[PDB]
Amino acid sequence: FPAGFGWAAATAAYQVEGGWDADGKGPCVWDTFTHQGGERVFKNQTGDVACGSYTLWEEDLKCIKQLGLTHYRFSLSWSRLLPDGTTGFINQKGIDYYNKIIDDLLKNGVTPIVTLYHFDLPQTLEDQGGWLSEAIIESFDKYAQFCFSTFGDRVKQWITINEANVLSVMSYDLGMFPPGIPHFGTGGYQAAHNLIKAHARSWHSYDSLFRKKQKGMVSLSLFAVWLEPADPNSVSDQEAAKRAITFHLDLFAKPIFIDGDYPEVVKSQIASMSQKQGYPSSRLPEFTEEEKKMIKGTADFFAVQYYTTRLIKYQENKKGELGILQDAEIEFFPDPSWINVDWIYVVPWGVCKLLKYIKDTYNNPVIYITENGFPQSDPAPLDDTQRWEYFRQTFQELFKAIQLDKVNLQVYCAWSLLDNFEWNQGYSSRFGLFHVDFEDPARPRVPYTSAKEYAKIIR
Ligand SMILES: *[C@@H]1O[C@H](CO)[C@@H](O[C@@H]2O[C@H](CO)[C@@H](O)[C@H](O)[C@H]2NC(C)=O)[C@H](O)[C@H]1NC(C)=O
Numbered sequence: 001f002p003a004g005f006g007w008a009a010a011t012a013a014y015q016v017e018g019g020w021d022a023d024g025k026g027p028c029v030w031d032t033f034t035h036q037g038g039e040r041v042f043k044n045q046t047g048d049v050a051c052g053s054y055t056l057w058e059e060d061l062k063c064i065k066q067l068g069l070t071h072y073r074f075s076l077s078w079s080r081l082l083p084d085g086t087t088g089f090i091n092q093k094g095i096d097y098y099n100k101i102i103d104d105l106l107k108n109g110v111t112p113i114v115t116l117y118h119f120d121l122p123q124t125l126e127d128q129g130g131w132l133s134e135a136i137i138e139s140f141d142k143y144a145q146f147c148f149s150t151f152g153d154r155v156k157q158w159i160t161i162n163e164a165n166v167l168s169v170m171s172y173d174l175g176m177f178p179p180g181i182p183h184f185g186t187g188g189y190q191a192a193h194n195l196i197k198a199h200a201r202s203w204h205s206y207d208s209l210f211r212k213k214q215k216g217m218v219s220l221s222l223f224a225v226w227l228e229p230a231d232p233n234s235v236s237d238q239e240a241a242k243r244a245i246t247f248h249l250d251l252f253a254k255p256i257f258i259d260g261d262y263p264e265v266v267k268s269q270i271a272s273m274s275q276k277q278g279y280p281s282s283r284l285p286e287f288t289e290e291e292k293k294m295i296k297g298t299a300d301f302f303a304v305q306y307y308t309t310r311l312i313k314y315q316e317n318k319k320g321e322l323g324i325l326q327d328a329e330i331e332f333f334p335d336p337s338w339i340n341v342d343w344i345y346v347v348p349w350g351v352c353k354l355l356k357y358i359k360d361t362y363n364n365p366v367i368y369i370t371e372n373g374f375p376q377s378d379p380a381p382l383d384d385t386q387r388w389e390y391f392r393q394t395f396q397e398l399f400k401a402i403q404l405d406k407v408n409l410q411v412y413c414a415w416s417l418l419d420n421f422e423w424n425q426g427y428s429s430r431f432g433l434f435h436v437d438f439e440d441p442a443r444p445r446v447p448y449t450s451a452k453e454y455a456k457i458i459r
Contacts, residue, residue, distance in 0.1 A: 169325065
């Protein structure tokens with residue numbers, strides 16, 4: 001912890017807000033998804049109410065204040081602000097609401113960090129192809145412009161798209177998020193393409209239209225699992241684990257932070273294999289030469305969201321097999337003496353290695369951890385000393401990264417002010433620094449030991 005370092009906790013519109021059809025709000029895709037049932041969400045839970053944050057925002061403020069956060073990361077509800085997705089119909093109640101969060105945040109001396117989009121397309125926009133249609137690029141840019149215009153007089157730190165990588169894979173490649181149709185090996189790259197251009201244009205709208213007057217900074221956040229060779233000094237695995245990084249992280253960061261084009265490994269591997277089943281073209285779409293000039297250097301800081309490490313081994317696509325992006329000839333798993341809670345294997349030395357990697361691959365950028373954290377399964381909590389130790393270690397290696405490795409880290413943001421709707425997991429996993437009880441109509445917030453113990457770290 002150097003400089004005037006920022007400590008923050010993130011929330012996300014759909015995961016905490018409720019009021020899904022309150023005050024003019026248009027349906028978003030999770031509204032349609034969770035209302036459909038099937039066993040897509042744990043127990044068919046919805047975010048109709050979630051933490052009730054659209055109604056109990058001062059409760060959130062109280063927690064923020066109690067933590068003494070220097071910053072606070074939340075997202076804007078695209079369909080709360082623009083019910084049909086466009087500026088053709090503006091919801092003043094949505095505007096009043098985010099205006100209040102921001103104003104309250106500034107009067108308590110806390111700096112807002114605003115995600116424009118967090119896995120939550122307006123239903124209207126998804127009906128028109130979602131991130132599969134390039135029509136989306138213009139849609140997002142106009143929405144982004146609207147957000148800068150309305151909130152930018154006093155918001156100076158923006159994340160445009162939250163985890164576009166996790167988004168393209170879960171929404172369109174794996175079919176796990178809405179719109180929930182599988183598409184193994186085509187969906188993800190097809191979305192990723194549009195998410196890259198849409199982020200890119202949105203950045204250029206900000207640089208052109210608001211940056212002079214507003215003086216803020218803008219990027220997008222990326223999910224990074226840090227990867228290690230299953231067996232080390234076993235040569236194949238060594239390059240496999242590197243290649244799997246370029247596939248999940250650099251597929252987005254190379255174009256945006258460097259040179260404006262996909263990584264070379266990626267282009268060759270997908271193309272080659274697309275000859276495969278006799279696709280008439282690669283499944284990695286192509287950036288035009290014009291596009292590359294638009295996309296490059298289109299980020300004001302590097303923003304990662306870290307949670308875990310994995311071990312990776314080589315796995316030849318002996319008999320070509322569809323995409324799953326994995327069929328870039330990798331297989332992943334944990335080293336067997338790691339602690340877990342669902343998907344998050346507690347490997348805190350991973351962020352340090354991840355942070356020098358970023359410094360090494362992206363010319364020493366300013367970095368924010370815009371999400372880091374650990375969940376607990378329904379009952380475990382309050383005196384969550386197990387979990388808090390996990391946090392301690394993570395900060396310990398964070399210290400090492402700044403000191404020994406000289407990484408330009410300026411923000412640590414913890415994933416999560418509140419226990420909330422964790423997508424398919426529903427309320428069955430709890431990443432909050434503050435417990436929330438979803439059974440009483442109030443939605444009371446009580447600190448975890450972590451909450452109290454994170455306040456101290458904010459030295
Ligand atoms: C989640 O909601 C779905 C509805 O989409 C439930 O589906 C029902 O499943 C039961 C058997 O478990 C069937 O008898 C019903 O016919 C199904 N409902 C309909 C109308 O399709 C599902 O049971 C729910 N699961 C949980 C765990 O709550």
